[PDB]
Amino acid sequence: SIKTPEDIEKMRVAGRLAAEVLEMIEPYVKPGVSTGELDRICNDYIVNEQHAVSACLGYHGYPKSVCISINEVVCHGIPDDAKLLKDGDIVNIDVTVIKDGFHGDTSKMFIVGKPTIMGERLCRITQESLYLALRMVKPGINLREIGAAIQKFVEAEGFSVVREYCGHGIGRGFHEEPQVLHYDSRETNVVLKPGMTFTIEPMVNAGKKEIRTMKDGWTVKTKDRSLSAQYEHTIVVTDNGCEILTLRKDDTIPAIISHDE
Ligand SMILES: [Mn+2]
Ligand SMILES: [Mn+2]
Ligand code: NA
């Protein structure tokens, strides 16, 4: 799927909105706030201000507008009014918006209250793994290299990479081809071409890689109950690199990454 100059522009709009939801919610992510209220804030904003729609809601029956995962929760945490954030917590807020027919998908970690050493480190190393992978993207390279480089980096830090979930192609469809694994796999055989749009979203655990799913059909936790973090960005392969469509002001990497010169 090679997006056209116009479709790419739409992806920029959808990606920007997704990223802006994360920038907007930051001030609300504090101790004592419930994940349920954070969700309502994000939804009212997406609908009433961005004039877009959450792609998560209803997707395979997902009940909320955004996914919020805390500490040992790996992904797909469901916003709840009874779940309050507290100091030391590391929280992922996963956002997916649909606008003008195109999707914008992204997520980041938030450290609540006073940070713990492992909390700050895990999140930091996880973002560094995403950035390292991003700096690699450019026409010609094979997706298998990006996944191999992520796993290599993360494991040398003494952490592990989650296997059950992966990045994905994205466009008029929420999840399109190809699959973007965050570890080395002999199945990956894709040569990036300019115009391609997909996501990179590594999930990293402080302990072992195994993840156990809960009895609600969604919530995934680490088997050993160790902390797990994830960061996600949607990108578009440019002629000499890539462009991050969901870049935020707090990101410390440039929107456009060039390689030719
Ligand atoms: Mn995604
Ligand atoms: Mn996502
Ligand atoms: Na987590």
Swiss-Prot record:
Its EC number is 3.4.11.18
Keyword entries, A-Z: Aminopeptidase, Hydrolase, Metal-binding, Protease
* Residues where substrate binds: 76, 96, 175
Tell me a GO cellular component: cytosol
* Cited function: Removes the N-terminal methionine from nascent proteins. The N-terminal methionine is often cleaved when the second residue in the primary sequence is small and uncharged (Met-Ala-, Cys, Gly, Pro, Ser, Thr, or Val). Requires deformylation of the N(alpha)-formylated initiator methionine before it can be hydrolyzed.
This protein's species is: Escherichia coli (strain K12)
The subunit field of the Swiss-Prot or TrEMBL record says: Monomer.
The molecular function GO annotations come to: ferrous iron binding; initiator methionyl aminopeptidase activity; metalloaminopeptidase activity
What is the name listed in the Swiss-Prot or TrEMBL entry for this protein? Methionine aminopeptidase
Q: Which PANTHER family match?
A: METHIONINE AMINOPEPTIDASE
Q: What class of enzyme is it?
A: hydrolase
Matching InterPro entries, A to Z? Creatinase/aminopeptidase-like (IPR036005), Pept_M24 (IPR000994), Pept_M24_MAP (IPR001714), Pept_M24A_MAP1 (IPR002467)
Free-text cofactor note: Binds 2 divalent metal cations per subunit. Has a high-affinity and a low affinity metal-binding site. The true nature of the physiological cofactor is under debate. The enzyme is active with cobalt, zinc, manganese or divalent iron ions. Most likely, methionine aminopeptidases function as mononuclear Fe(2+)-metalloproteases under physiological conditions, and the catalytically relevant metal-binding site has been assigned to the histidine-containing high-affinity site. Binds 1 sodium ion per subunit. The sodium ion has a structural role.
Which residues are noted in the entry as a divalent metal cation 2-binding? 105, 168, 201, 232
Which cofactor names does the annotation list?
Answer: Co(2+); Zn(2+); Mn(2+); Fe(2+)
Gene name of the record: map
Q: Can the keyword Amino-acid biosynthesis be found in this entry's annotation?
A: no
